[PDB]
Amino acid sequence: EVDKRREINNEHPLLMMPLYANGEEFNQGKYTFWGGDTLTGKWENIPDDLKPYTVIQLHPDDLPKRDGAARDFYEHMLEEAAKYVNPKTGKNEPIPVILTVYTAGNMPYYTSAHWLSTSWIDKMYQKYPNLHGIFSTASYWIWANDIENKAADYLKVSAKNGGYFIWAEQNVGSAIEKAFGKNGKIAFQKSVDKYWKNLIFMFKNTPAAEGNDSTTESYMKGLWLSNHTYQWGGLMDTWKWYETGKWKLFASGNIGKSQGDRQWLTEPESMLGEEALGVYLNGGVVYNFEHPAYTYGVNNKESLLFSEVIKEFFRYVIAHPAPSKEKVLEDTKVFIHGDYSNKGNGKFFVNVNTDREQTPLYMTGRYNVIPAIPGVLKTDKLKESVSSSRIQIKEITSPEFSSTQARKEYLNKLYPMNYEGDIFAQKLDNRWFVYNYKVNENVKQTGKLKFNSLEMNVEFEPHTYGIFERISNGLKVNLNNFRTNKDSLWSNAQDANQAKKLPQLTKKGAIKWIEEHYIKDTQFGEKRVTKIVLRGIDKLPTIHSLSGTNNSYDQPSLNFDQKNHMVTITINSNGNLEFELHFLEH
Numbered sequence: 001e002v003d004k005r006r007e008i009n010n011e012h013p014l015l016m017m018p019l020y021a022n023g024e025e026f027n028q029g030k031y032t033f034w035g036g037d038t039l040t041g042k043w044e045n046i047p048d049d050l051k052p053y054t055v056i057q058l059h060p061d062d063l064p065k066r067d068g069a070a071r072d073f074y075e076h077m078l079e080e081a082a083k084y085v086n087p088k089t090g091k092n093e094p095i096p097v098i099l100t101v102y103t104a105g106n107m108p109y110y111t112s113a114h115w116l117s118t119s120w121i122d123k124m125y126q127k128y129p130n131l132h133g134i135f136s137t138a139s140y141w142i143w144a145n146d147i148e149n150k151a152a153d154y155l156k157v158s159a160k161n162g163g164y165f166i167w168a169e170q171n172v173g174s175a176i177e178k179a180f181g182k183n184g185k186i187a188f189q190k191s192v193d194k195y196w197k198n199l200i201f202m203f204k205n206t207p208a209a210e211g212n213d214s215t216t217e218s219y220m221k222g223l224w225l226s227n228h229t230y231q232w233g234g235l236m237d238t239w240k241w242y243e244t245g246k247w248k249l250f251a252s253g254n255i256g257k258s259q260g261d262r263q264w265l266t267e268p269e270s271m272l273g274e275e276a277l278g279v280y281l282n283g284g285v286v287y288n289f290e291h292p293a294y295t296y297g298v299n300n301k302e303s304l305l306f307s308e309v310i311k312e313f314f315r316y317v318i319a320h321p322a323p324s325k326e327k328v329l330e331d332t333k334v335f336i337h338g339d340y341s342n343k344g345n346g347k348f349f350v351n352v353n354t355d356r357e358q359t360p361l362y363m364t365g366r367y368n369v370i371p372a373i374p375g376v377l378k379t380d381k382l383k384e385s386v387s388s389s390r391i392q393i394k395e396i397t398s399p400e401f402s403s404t405q406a407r408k409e410y411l412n413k414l415y416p417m418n419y420e421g422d423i424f425a426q427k428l429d430n431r432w433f434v435y436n437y438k439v440n441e442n443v444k445q446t447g448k449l450k451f452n453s454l455e456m457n458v459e460f461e462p463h464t465y466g467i468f469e470r471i472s473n474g475l476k477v478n479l480n481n482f483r484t485n486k487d488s489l490w491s492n493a494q495d496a497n498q499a500k501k502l503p504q505l506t507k508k509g510a511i512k513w514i515e516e517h518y519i520k521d522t523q524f525g526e527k528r529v530t531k532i533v534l535r536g537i538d539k540l541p542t543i544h545s546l547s548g549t550n551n552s553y554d555q556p557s558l559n560f561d562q563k564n565h566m567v568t569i570t571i572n573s574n575g576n577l578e579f580e581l582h583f584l585e586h
């Protein structure tokens, strides 16, 4: 083992910061990114507390599809990254970089990344200590004949240099299963046997119409727990709204894949946090997002989605490290071995812990995420772990997995019901994590959670998550329901058919819209009500350390009922919010 260039784990999570090459301007002799971010400007704008946990991910996007283009662009930016001087201290502080080296099967008709040899990658690793890793993303839909052989080389050249190979992929057409050798292409399987400590595997939830969210995330978690990857994460993509044909929030009708650039703007901001919770709560530590202009920002400025949701969520996972592999293994009661492709893919979990075929969310935390590995792999390194002796390792073909009903009946015996109400809730140590799991339906949800004898009832509108921590002097609360009004994008269309026929916003038009109507002159959503009821309380609680998105919340209202020893907390907000309540139990 060569010394790793960086740590990636629960205590050192990783936020990837994508910068997409502008190929049109490249043809004009410029070195720029779509959305107007600069490498240096973006890095400088990253908050100093986040800098140790964030890496700039270069992507070749629409660079010319010919030899030399991607190399020329990448060498230019690695030079900029390497020579960076911190203006406050005057010291050279090389900016850490990940290069996107593989995507779209590296077909010469799809990407300039085709003309990046492993020899060149090796050269850049040796030249640039700030090159921390290389990234393969989104070939599920174009599974090239030598993809597994090429992934083996990427992992090996990374290991050789102490860098990470990062692969984001979704289980469309058995991609994850094939990667590990299902169809007999075993090169990457063998590479992983030697070099897994340098591999990061991530889901990529983009192809949402295929509904592989639950099954891909289950693999990512199981690969990690069984030592087939060093850590895991997910790329969470607002393009899912396009893939599934949604339009105006809560509107009826499906428009199909007809308004791409309006559609990738429409996913509620807070829903990205709901998606990211599934990574964190299950020991994942790597985060990435598309579309970058919405999820991160433009012109070296943070979008409100980034500042109010993603940034604050990432700060949370740094302050409260995700459960360790040891911890997750200890809590795991069932571990699946086999191919989800043989068992209905995402349908496997529908009405088990997901409410529908096409969703990135869960409807219960009762089983958290059941971890799995493809049938091609062995559970040897899993059983070698000391923390894994209480786990039932089960073939996916077992009768307990044969139907929806059999799955719940089997899992219910091993995972006890630990809350009430039709809402998503999961508990870690002294913390309840809660969200409303509705995607595009305006329906409130309620739950009853307990901290021993203390009862907490909550009422959540859609696109609202909360983290409730029992501390010695009371309850720490994090709430996020940030959701701006996107209706303007869908102006002039009263129904789905009409929305289909709107003029294309276009990629450049959407970037412009962000600049003109999201970065500034934002159409904020209306404040909306969250209720929290605590039963078993001695006196009216006091509120402390209240803060949140500027101008986004009314002062919380507390109504204490001495006779019933209970308080009703009414919050009216639209944003990120945190406070503590101080009280004693009765």
Ligand SMILES: CC(=O)N[C@@H]1[C@@H](O)[C@H](O[C@@H]2O[C@H](CO)[C@H](O)[C@H](O[C@H]3O[C@H](CO)[C@H](O)[C@H](O)[C@H]3NC(C)=O)[C@H]2O[C@@H]2O[C@@H](C)[C@@H](O)[C@@H](O)[C@@H]2O)[C@@H](CO)O[C@H]1O
Pocket: 020, 034, 059, 061, 062, 103, 104, 110, 137, 138, 141, 206, 207, 239, 240, 242, 243, 290, 291, 292, 507
């Ligand atoms: C040949 C073909 O059409 N291939 C499709 C893939 O490109 C799709 O991958 C992503 O799908 C999105 C739609 O769900 C979208 O097209 C996205 O690209 C657009 O957005 C990104 C930033 O998010 C860039 O701005 C791209 O320039 C822009 N492209 C277009 C034409 O609008 C696709 O993601 C990109 O491409 C893939 C291959 C990876 O390289 C990603 O890292 C890129 O961001 C796929 C969806 O399942 O569908 C294929 O048919």
